[PDB]
Design an enzyme around this catalytic site. Sequence first.
Site, mmCIF file in Angstrom:
data_model
loop_
_atom_site.group_PDB
_atom_site.id
_atom_site.type_symbol
_atom_site.label_atom_id
_atom_site.label_comp_id
_atom_site.label_asym_id
_atom_site.label_seq_id
_atom_site.Cartn_x
_atom_site.Cartn_y
_atom_site.Cartn_z
ATOM 1 N N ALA A 1 0.834 -1.226 0.000
ATOM 2 C CA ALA A 1 0.000 0.000 0.000
ATOM 3 C C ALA A 1 0.860 1.265 0.000
ATOM 4 C CB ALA A 1 -0.968 0.008 1.167
ATOM 5 N N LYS B 1 2.052 1.789 -5.341
ATOM 6 C CA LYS B 1 2.716 1.308 -6.584
ATOM 7 C C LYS B 1 1.662 1.178 -7.675
ATOM 8 C CE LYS B 1 4.295 -2.399 -4.627
ATOM 9 N NZ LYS B 1 3.658 -1.973 -3.352
ATOM 10 N N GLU C 1 1.236 -6.545 -10.963
ATOM 11 C CA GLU C 1 1.664 -7.714 -10.165
ATOM 12 C C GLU C 1 0.525 -8.728 -10.133
ATOM 13 O OE1 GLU C 1 4.027 -7.932 -6.258
ATOM 14 O OE2 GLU C 1 1.954 -7.531 -5.685
ATOM 15 N N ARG D 1 6.517 -4.401 -9.145
ATOM 16 C CA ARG D 1 7.489 -5.308 -8.467
ATOM 17 C C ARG D 1 8.198 -6.213 -9.494
ATOM 18 N NH1 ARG D 1 3.928 -6.396 -3.624
ATOM 19 N NH2 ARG D 1 4.593 -4.864 -2.056
ATOM 20 N N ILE E 1 -3.415 0.937 3.751
ATOM 21 C CA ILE E 1 -4.182 -0.351 3.825
ATOM 22 C C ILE E 1 -5.620 -0.052 4.263
ATOM 23 C CG2 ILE E 1 -4.541 -2.447 5.170
ATOM 24 C CD1 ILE E 1 -1.258 -2.476 5.158
ATOM 25 N N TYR E 2 -5.791 0.819 5.258
ATOM 26 C CA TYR E 2 -7.116 1.235 5.794
ATOM 27 C C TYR E 2 -7.920 1.870 4.653
ATOM 28 C CZ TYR E 2 -10.435 4.346 8.215
ATOM 29 O OH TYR E 2 -11.559 5.028 8.596
ATOM 30 N N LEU E 3 -7.372 2.913 4.020
ATOM 31 C CA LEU E 3 -8.004 3.561 2.841
ATOM 32 C C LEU E 3 -8.411 2.513 1.802
ATOM 33 C CD1 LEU E 3 -5.815 6.783 2.399
ATOM 34 C CD2 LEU E 3 -8.051 6.553 3.485
ATOM 35 N N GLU F 1 3.545 11.881 1.099
ATOM 36 C CA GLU F 1 2.479 12.853 0.737
ATOM 37 C C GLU F 1 1.613 12.213 -0.351
ATOM 38 O OE1 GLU F 1 1.410 17.238 -0.697
ATOM 39 O OE2 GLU F 1 3.589 17.052 -0.338
ATOM 40 N N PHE G 1 -0.290 11.714 -3.654
ATOM 41 C CA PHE G 1 0.165 12.171 -4.994
ATOM 42 C C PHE G 1 -0.929 11.926 -6.038
ATOM 43 C CE2 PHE G 1 1.970 7.883 -4.593
ATOM 44 C CZ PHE G 1 1.460 7.282 -5.720
HETATM 45 C C1 LIG Z 1 -2.784 -13.337 1.157
HETATM 46 C C2 LIG Z 1 -1.997 -13.558 2.413
HETATM 47 C C3 LIG Z 1 -2.567 -14.261 3.470
HETATM 48 C C4 LIG Z 1 -1.871 -14.478 4.641
HETATM 49 C C5 LIG Z 1 -0.585 -14.004 4.772
HETATM 50 N N1 LIG Z 1 0.018 -14.296 5.998
HETATM 51 C C6 LIG Z 1 1.303 -14.131 6.337
HETATM 52 O O1 LIG Z 1 2.125 -13.510 5.648
HETATM 53 C C7 LIG Z 1 1.656 -14.667 7.688
HETATM 54 C C8 LIG Z 1 2.942 -15.137 7.922
HETATM 55 C C9 LIG Z 1 3.314 -15.587 9.178
HETATM 56 C C10 LIG Z 1 2.392 -15.621 10.221
HETATM 57 C C11 LIG Z 1 2.794 -16.089 11.600
HETATM 58 N N2 LIG Z 1 3.166 -17.502 11.794
HETATM 59 C C12 LIG Z 1 2.387 -18.154 12.851
HETATM 60 C C13 LIG Z 1 3.029 -19.471 13.219
HETATM 61 N N3 LIG Z 1 3.171 -20.355 12.061
HETATM 62 C C14 LIG Z 1 3.886 -21.582 12.425
HETATM 63 C C15 LIG Z 1 3.835 -19.673 10.946
HETATM 64 C C16 LIG Z 1 3.157 -18.363 10.609
HETATM 65 C C17 LIG Z 1 1.106 -15.135 9.987
HETATM 66 C C18 LIG Z 1 0.733 -14.680 8.729
HETATM 67 C C19 LIG Z 1 0.013 -13.284 3.741
HETATM 68 C C20 LIG Z 1 -0.700 -13.075 2.565
HETATM 69 N N4 LIG Z 1 -0.132 -12.346 1.514
HETATM 70 C C21 LIG Z 1 1.147 -12.390 1.044
HETATM 71 N N5 LIG Z 1 1.428 -11.914 -0.135
HETATM 72 C C22 LIG Z 1 2.781 -12.085 -0.418
HETATM 73 C C23 LIG Z 1 3.324 -11.618 -1.672
HETATM 74 N N6 LIG Z 1 2.808 -10.488 -2.179
HETATM 75 C C24 LIG Z 1 3.288 -10.059 -3.360
HETATM 76 C C25 LIG Z 1 4.322 -10.697 -4.004
HETATM 77 C C26 LIG Z 1 4.804 -11.875 -3.419
HETATM 78 N N7 LIG Z 1 5.796 -12.580 -4.004
HETATM 79 N N8 LIG Z 1 4.301 -12.327 -2.266
HETATM 80 C C27 LIG Z 1 3.494 -12.711 0.565
HETATM 81 S S1 LIG Z 1 2.488 -13.074 1.915
HETATM 82 O O1 LIG Z 2 -0.744 8.903 -2.983
HETATM 83 C C1 LIG Z 2 -1.591 8.032 -2.710
HETATM 84 C C2 LIG Z 2 -1.240 6.676 -2.916
HETATM 85 C C3 LIG Z 2 -2.185 5.712 -2.586
HETATM 86 N N1 LIG Z 2 -3.380 6.078 -2.040
HETATM 87 C C4 LIG Z 2 -4.353 5.074 -1.673
HETATM 88 O O2 LIG Z 2 -3.668 4.126 -0.818
HETATM 89 C C5 LIG Z 2 -4.126 2.809 -1.121
HETATM 90 C C6 LIG Z 2 -2.928 1.949 -1.515
HETATM 91 O O3 LIG Z 2 -2.418 2.303 -2.793
HETATM 92 P P1 LIG Z 2 -2.004 1.197 -3.898
HETATM 93 O O4 LIG Z 2 -3.096 0.215 -4.048
HETATM 94 O O5 LIG Z 2 -1.559 1.912 -5.143
HETATM 95 O O6 LIG Z 2 -0.729 0.514 -3.155
HETATM 96 P P2 LIG Z 2 0.256 -0.679 -3.653
HETATM 97 O O7 LIG Z 2 -0.072 -1.857 -2.779
HETATM 98 O O8 LIG Z 2 -0.138 -1.052 -5.074
HETATM 99 O O9 LIG Z 2 1.594 -0.080 -3.390
HETATM 100 C C7 LIG Z 2 -5.176 2.949 -2.220
HETATM 101 O O10 LIG Z 2 -6.477 2.900 -1.620
HETATM 102 C C8 LIG Z 2 -4.856 4.282 -2.860
HETATM 103 O O11 LIG Z 2 -5.969 4.825 -3.515
HETATM 104 C C9 LIG Z 2 -3.683 7.450 -1.836
HETATM 105 O O12 LIG Z 2 -4.796 7.738 -1.335
HETATM 106 N N2 LIG Z 2 -2.782 8.388 -2.178
#
Ligand SMILES: Cc1ccc(NC(=O)c2ccc(CN3CCN(C)CC3)cc2)cc1Nc1nc(-c2nccc(N)n2)cs1
Ligand SMILES: O=c1ccn([C@@H]2O[C@H](COP(=O)(O)OP(=O)(O)O)[C@@H](O)[C@H]2O)c(=O)[nH]1
Lengths: 228, 228
Positions: free
Chosen positions: A12, A15, A34, A99, A157-159, A208, A210
């Site tokens: 967030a 990107k 991505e 990414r 993330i909240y937004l 800020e 953008f």
């Molecule tokens: C969708 C989702 C859902 C769940 C989690 N959760 C965790 O990351 C996470 C890990 C660790 C833990 C604690 N421990 C407890 C004890 N356990 C034994 C072992 C885990 C709790 C939660 C992550 C995601 N998203 C993710 N996206 C990416 C990613 N995003 C872009 C490019 C890319 N290559 N990879 C990576 S991770």
């Molecule tokens: O300058 C900014 C950049 C992002 N966002 C908001 O922040 C959130 C995260 O942005 P984005 O999804 O682009 O993040 P990424 O995970 O792709 O870096 C979204 O709700 C955007 O609309 C914003 O309000 N102003």
Amino acid sequence: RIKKISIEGNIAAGKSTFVNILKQLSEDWEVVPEPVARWSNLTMEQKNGGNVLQMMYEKPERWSFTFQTYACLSRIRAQLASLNGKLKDAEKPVLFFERSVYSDRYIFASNLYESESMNETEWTIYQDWHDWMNNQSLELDGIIYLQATPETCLHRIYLRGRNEEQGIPLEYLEKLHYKHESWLLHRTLKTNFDYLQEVPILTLDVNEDFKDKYESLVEKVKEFLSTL
Amino acid sequence: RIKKISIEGNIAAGKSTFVNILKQLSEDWEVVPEPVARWSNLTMEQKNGGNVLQMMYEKPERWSFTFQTYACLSRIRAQLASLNGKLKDAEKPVLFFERSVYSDRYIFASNLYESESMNETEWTIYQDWHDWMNNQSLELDGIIYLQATPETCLHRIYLRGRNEEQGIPLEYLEKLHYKHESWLLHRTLKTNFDYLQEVPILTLDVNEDFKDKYESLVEKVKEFLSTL
Ligand SMILES: Cc1ccc(NC(=O)c2ccc(CN3CCN(C)CC3)cc2)cc1Nc1nc(-c2nccc(N)n2)cs1
Ligand SMILES: O=c1ccn([C@@H]2O[C@H](COP(=O)(O)OP(=O)(O)O)[C@@H](O)[C@H]2O)c(=O)[nH]1
Ligand SMILES: Cc1ccc(NC(=O)c2ccc(CN3CCN(C)CC3)cc2)cc1Nc1nc(-c2nccc(N)n2)cs1
Ligand SMILES: Cc1ccc(NC(=O)c2ccc(CN3CCN(C)CC3)cc2)cc1Nc1nc(-c2nccc(N)n2)cs1
Ligand SMILES: Cc1ccc(NC(=O)c2ccc(CN3CCN(C)CC3)cc2)cc1Nc1nc(-c2nccc(N)n2)cs1
Ligand SMILES: O=c1ccn([C@@H]2O[C@H](COP(=O)(O)OP(=O)(O)O)[C@@H](O)[C@H]2O)c(=O)[nH]1
Ligand code: NA
Ligand code: NA
């Protein structure tokens, strides 16, 4: 020759927002979103990716290896498709990656190994696969690092309001932030890709908002592109 | 041009034995042993593969996807290494593969999906990966099918005496046997590789011991090779 530029940053940071700004500014500018981002919002990749995302919420130590391998595959396929399919009539073609295969391994897969969501064999198999699956036409001319504080990303993330992401804690964002700083700012992270230590990096502070005020950031991009 | 021939057959049919016979008969003949076979008996692949084999004995429904992806990767890497490295001075070069990427998917990965050791997402991700990772210089000029009864293979598992394999039941060998017959004899198995339906297949009955009496089998091979 298509110039390949990766957009790197924390969850967030902005990107996706930045990439969808850039895409519109030149017909010679194209974007590869991505795959994981697209999975989060009909195709078999989307069906697979949505299932993998949900399974990961339930138990990461079961699905991290499967998720990281499919995420990286999906990215290589999508990047090569754009590289082979697009910008053939461009004068100064640039492809912006949301990414890279490097953030896949050195940020995410690495973090999951560290969070005990992959065992040593899963992490060693992942790295072997990655070293091999990355042996070419995807090497980067440049990196753009969108640098935001963990607090900024937590607020964004909240937004963005994905229900499944509201549980992400500040501490995790701080860890990802630290990895990004070591790789792209201090250049202290060792990778298995020698050319990476030489690749030009543009750092942009995106704390800020953008969305409606991005000309200064794009000016920095156009300047950076002219040096490559 | 190196001729690429896959040796296909059930567990303990005699493929390794046959391949090590062929290798010795011509300097223009080279072999790519099956990585999984080599894992079963110092390199990081061997360390990873031995761990994956042991983890698979304990719970296949946890490790089948990881195992099948690493097995197939390891095979592609090994086949391409031989294809790029060997037989450059050969007059009539032939590379014999101990099994193929097709037996990886249509025999083993398929069987593990059927035995509920992979879920639908793992199997769909596997097939997507396989379809993609197989997009070229590995396409087969020919297949040699070593056909043995399940009973023969069960007896040969006993002879080879791998402790970990003594538990393999006749029923499992019968299932693998049926898959081989559908793919290579009846040619009823649909694959996602169109050229495969046209590839010449030599079927050899290896129920009789051939370790010291293999000239008739090699004669059939040399005849088959001259038709390609
Ligand atoms: C969708 C989702 C859902 C769940 C989690 N959760 C965790 O990351 C996470 C890990 C660790 C833990 C604690 N421990 C407890 C004890 N356990 C034994 C072992 C885990 C709790 C939660 C992550 C995601 N998203 C993710 N996206 C990416 C990613 N995003 C872009 C490019 C890319 N290559 N990879 C990576 S991770
Ligand atoms: O300058 C900014 C950049 C992002 N966002 C908001 O922040 C959130 C995260 O942005 P984005 O999804 O682009 O993040 P990424 O995970 O792709 O870096 C979204 O709700 C955007 O609309 C914003 O309000 N102003
Ligand atoms: C809510 C919560 C609470 C705790 C933890 N725990 C750990 O992530 C974790 C870290 C490290 C370790 C080992 N360390 C620490 C302990 N030791 C002191 C030194 C070794 C053990 C466990 C995770 C969560 N959930 C999380 N959700 C996500 C996430 N959710 C969706 C998308 C996405 N990308 N990411 C990430 S993290
Ligand atoms: C080393 C090892 C260890 C164990 C097992 N085990 C099982 O095959 C197996 C499956 C199913 C079952 C029953 N069920 C119970 C209930 N569960 C819910 C679900 C499993 C019990 C056991 C197989 C192996 N070897 C294998 N090698 C290959 C292979 N060999 C060459 C090329 C290649 N691509 N692949 C495939 S499998
Ligand atoms: C000892 C034993 C006993 C039973 C079973 N079970 C199943 O494999 C299995 C089959 C199919 C199914 C669903 N089917 C059937 C039930 N329904 C009637 C219709 C759906 C459920 C379970 C496996 C074993 N062990 C096995 N070891 C191996 C092996 N071990 C080392 C290397 C190697 N390659 N292979 C393979 S099989
Ligand atoms: O004609 C034969 C073929 C094989 N074997 C033995 O049967 C076992 C299985 O053979 P191999 O390892 O070649 O089988 P694969 O799994 O490679 O098909 C080994 O102990 C062989 O020495 C044999 O005694 N006579
Ligand atoms: Na554009
Ligand atoms: Na030879």
